[PDB]
């Protein structure tokens, strides 16, 4: 009907939306509010409604919610942030329901986000990614993971709660989680692991090192399961595989008074079998072991009736420690065919 009557309807819904926002769901009639929203969209006033919706939410989250999270930065930040997120989710569900006819008719037909998805975008842009908040959340989640790794006891629950939220604001996508948390996390992790690798090489045996690497891989998988998105397992492991294994491949195998050659000489089968299973992860991993072996085996066979003893000893390793691998088999065989000439 007339411009004034339409503004009557919108004033009614605006007050209802604000009441919901203020946690006052009870006093409201679902059919009255739904009919008013319906009457607007039915009489082609959907844009007025949608534009109005985008305002009432934007204003609430900027003036009340952003402020709350900011005022509680150095006083229970993540908690003040999850409560902000929960209160929002709860409100946006009720807002989406009174405006259900707009979601089904207008939103579809006019290439715009749906009420809940719009609510998510505003919370994302105005609260979770507000620079000061965006940064303080990134530094918070990372300082916790760094403290945890360095021994301290931290709240994995608050960490999973923020990660779920970061994932959800991605709008059925990891866009927000990836750049706001994952990428900075992976970066600080690699810097940690690189330093960790330097300590363990300087004071632990190759067997101990290889064990400590497996232990680190297990810890990082165990961390993802308990407080990050399941999709971070492959990235973080590859960062452990890169910094601990891949970057120090020749260093590990060649370790003096330890390593492949000493393991082959002192016959420590399971120890070099452990090396095989770890070096089978990284590219050129097994190659390095073959190269180290071929260098030694050719130098040992060059010294050699007793080559039946050599063949049998390496046959045992290949079958037990090297899982009868095609590459190792060909390498051992290649070195034996080399002695003929």
């Amino acid at each position: 009907m007339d411009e004034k009557y339409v503004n009557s309807i919108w004033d009614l819904l605006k007050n209802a939306i604000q009441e919901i926002q203020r946690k006052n769901n009870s006093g409201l009639s679902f059919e009255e509010l739904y009919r008013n929203a319906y009457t607007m969209v039915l009489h082609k006033h959907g844009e007025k409604l949608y534009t109005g919706l985008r305002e009432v939410v934007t204003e609430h989250l900027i003036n009340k919610v952003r402020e709350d999270v900011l005022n509680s930065l150095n006083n229970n930040f993540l908690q003040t942030l999850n409560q902000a997120w929960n209160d929002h989710q709860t409100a946006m569900v009720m807002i989406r329901d009174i405006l259900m006819y707009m979601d089904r008719v207008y939103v579809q037909q006019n290439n715009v986000e749906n009420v809940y998805n719009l609510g998510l975008i505003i919370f994302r842009d105005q609260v979770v990614r507000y620079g000061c908040i965006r940064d303080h959340l990134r530094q918070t989640l990372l300082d916790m993971i760094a403290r945890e790794r360095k021994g301290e006891v931290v709240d994995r629950g608050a960490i999973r709660n923020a990660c779920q939220m970061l994932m959800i604001l991605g709008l059925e996508g990891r866009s927000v989680y990836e750049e706001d948390f994952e990428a900075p996390f992976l970066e600080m992790s690699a810097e940690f692991f690189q330093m960790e690798s330097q300590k363990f090489l300087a004071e632990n045996s190759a067997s101990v090192y290889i064990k400590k690497v497996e232990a680190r891989i297990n810890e990082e998988i165990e961390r993802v399961m308990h407080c990050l998105d399941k999709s971070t397992e492959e990235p973080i492991v590859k960062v452990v595989e890169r910094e601990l294994i891949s970057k120090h491949m020749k260093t590990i195998v060649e370790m003096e008074n330890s390593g492949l050659v000493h393991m082959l000489k002192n016959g420590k089968t399971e120890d070099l079998g452990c090396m095989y299973k770890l070096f089978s992860r990284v590219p050129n991993g097994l190659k390095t072991m073959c190269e180290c072996m071929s260098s030694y085996l050719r130098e040992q066979g060059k010294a050699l009736q007793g080559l039946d003893d050599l063949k049998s000893r390496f046959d045992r390793f290949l079958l037990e420690s090297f899982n009868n691998d095609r590459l190792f088999k060909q390498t051992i065989a290649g070195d034996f065919e080399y002695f003929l000439n």
């Binding site: 009870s26 409201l28 009639s29 679902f30 059919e31 509010l33 009174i98 259900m100 008719v105 037909q109």
Partner: protein, 264 residues
Amino acid sequence: EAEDFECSSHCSELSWRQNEQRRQGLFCDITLCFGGREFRAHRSVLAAATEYFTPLLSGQFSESRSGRVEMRKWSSEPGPEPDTVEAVIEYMYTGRIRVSTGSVHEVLELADRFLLIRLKEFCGEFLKKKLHLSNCVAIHSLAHMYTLSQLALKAADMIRRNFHKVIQDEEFYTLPFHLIRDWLSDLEITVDSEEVLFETVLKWVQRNAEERERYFEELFKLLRLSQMKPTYLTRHVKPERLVANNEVCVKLVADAVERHALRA
């Protein structure tokens, strides 16, 4: 080893037996009022039938505590015909309804309002068949109001092709302002001359003069005065009291005559 069982008949029976309950009032949860008659039904069924009833009956709003829902403000004065309401409520139970040549209007209202999308779909595929030369203007106003986009296009195309004759029948002079506005600014319309469009603006505005006069100025702006004959603009357009009253359009009708003289 195990084995799975499926009683094909089961759910068809279960639904029908629940309707038979509703008709006797057996185990009825909620009371649906449409005019000051009321229809007793089952919260479980209604909520299962459409996304609408779930938040209503949930527990976050007055209706859950009430145990009664006042369905108000319908196109029909004391609401739709009870027969059409019982028909649609039964459909929510059974998924079976008969839509008459008359039923279809009120059925499409409820179907659309109560978010019963597969029933709304049917009405759309129904009217698409019942679409004709007389049917087209009334069906377009339906398809446009109840967002039946596929049907709106087929109804619009038949109006664009037969515009010269659709403006002859009184059916068009019922249309709301926003639809007149959208028709005048529609370019694929097929009329003999642009002068006829003015005669239709003047005809339509005259009907509900007291409420319709406000629009005229906006509607006159839509008129492509360039494609109109200068003899017509000087003798028939300029002397109209409706055009002589507003000074915004006397300037536009003056520039139009100015432009024709300037075309030589």
